[PDB]
Every structure is written in C-alpha cells, then in structure tokens.
C-alpha cells in the first residue's frame, strides 16, 4: 500500500495564500511568506510571484 503523498507533484498556484492547503503536515500561517512555506521549500509548489525578483 503506497499512499499518494510520496508521489512527486508540483502544483502551479496563482494565489500564494492557497499554498497552505497543499500539505496537511505543517503549521500553516497566513503571515508566513511563500518561500518560507514547506510545500514551496520541497519543490511541490510554484508561483509566478517568486519570479518578480
């Protein structure tokens, strides 16, 4: 029995705040920036906002 949380998935999100919904095993915080979030730090979430740099 191999659950789906181990499958490598990258999700394109337009709204950064929605990144809290991608993973359930982290402490979500609206004030936390997108790069600090666990799903982004793991390469599972990407947004065009980080390209503004």
């Amino acid at each position: 029995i191999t659950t789906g949380v181990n499958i490598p998935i990258i999700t394109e999100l337009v709204n950064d705040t929605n990144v809290q919904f991608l993973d359930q095993d982290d402490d979500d915080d609206p004030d936390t920036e997108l790069y600090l979030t666990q799903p982004f730090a793991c390469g599972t979430a990407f947004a065009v906002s980080v390209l503004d740099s």
């Binding site: 705040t17 809290q20 919904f21 359930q24 979500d28 915080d29 609206p30």
Partner: protein, 197 residues
C-alpha cells in the same frame, strides 16, 4: 491707538472659534476689532468647510473597528460546535429552532457561528434571544487565525451551510468545497457535516 482691545484669554478665544466653526453662534464672546472681524470673515468660509468635511470623517474613522473580534473561551465539562457557511437570518433561525428544541435531552452544547459578514439587526436580536446558547464571531473560514479564534481544535463538530437558491450551483458547491478544504487543512480530525448541491 490700540483702544479697541478686548480682554480675551486664550481659552476664551479657543471656545469662541469652537462655537463659530461649528456654526452654532452664541454672541457671548465675539471679535470686536476690525482685524478680528476680517479674520472671522475668512475663517468662516475656511474653518466651516473644514469642520463640516472633517468632524464626521474623524468620528467615523475612530468609531469603526471589529465588533466580534474576540475568541471563544472553552468551558470544562461543556462541548461546543462551530457553524459556518451560508449564515443568514432564516438559516440561523431554522437551525436554532431545530437544534435547541425541548424535545431533545438536556444537552448543554454551545453553538459558535463564524461568519465573515457582520450580522444585521434582526440576526443580532436573534442572537440576543439565545444569549446563553449562541455566540457569534466575525472571520473567514479560509483564514487559519479565525479558525483558531473559535477554538476549532476543541470543537465537537463543524457544520457548513450552503445557499440552496444560488443562481449558479457550481460556484456555491466550489465555495463549500474550499471551506471544507480550509477547515480540514487547519484540523484534519474535525468532524464536517456539509451540504452538497
């Protein structure tokens, strides 16, 4: 030859321009010199416009703030449920009528509503009628801080209500889907009872 001088203290002049600038007028104190009356003529226009356009704005800026911005305080020995979603006067009234009926046992279960829209006068009166059984809080389900305010981690269940009369059923279904997503994201073990169109 400075023979028109009037013995006016600074506080008296402050009071005089308070009376003038508000268009009240008393005549107990007023400017008697020519320069004073010229300045009063100019200040009438200026200060009257400023007072009229400023005082209501300042009052409305100071007065406004969150009204239901507190946090629910759990009480030992008593359980509470959280109700979110389509929160209107009719839906809340029906839920309270069918939830707190005397036909059930003496169940001491508090109800905490979480809604991003401030209730109107009728909803406030309905909440006042159920003073010891119903509490309300303003906030969004998608905001984790609002979910933490109502102490969802200790809530017995979470109930989500849907607008069954929406013009587009798909939009309401999707909004309920993300309400479910947010509440499960905050606490995954919480019980969800939700309507699907």
């Amino acid at each position: 030859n400075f023979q028109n001088n009037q013995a006016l203290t600074y506080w008296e002049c402050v009071y005089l321009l308070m009376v003038t600038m508000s268009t009240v007028g008393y005549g107990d104190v007023y400017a008697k010199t020519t320069l004073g009356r010229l300045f009063m003529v100019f200040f009438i226009l200026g200060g009257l416009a400023m007072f009229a356009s400023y005082v209501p704005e300042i009052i409305e800026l100071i007065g406004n703030r969150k009204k239901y911005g507190g946090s629910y305080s759990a009480v030992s020995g008593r359980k509470h449920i959280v109700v979110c979603g389509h929160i209107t006067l009719e839906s809340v009234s029906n839920f309270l009528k069918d939830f707190l009926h005397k036909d059930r046992d003496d169940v001491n279960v508090e109800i905490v509503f979480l809604h991003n829209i401030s209730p109107n006068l009728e909803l406030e009166a309905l909440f006042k009628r159920h003073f010891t059984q119903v509490e309300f809080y303003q906030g969004s389900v998608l905001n984790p801080h609002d979910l933490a305010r109502v102490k969802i981690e200790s809530a017995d269940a979470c109930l989500i209500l849907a607008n069954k009369y929406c013009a587009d059923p798909d939009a309401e279904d999707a909004s309920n889907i993300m309400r479910v997503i947010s509440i499960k994201n905050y606490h995954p073990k919480i019980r969800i009872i939700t309507q699907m169109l």
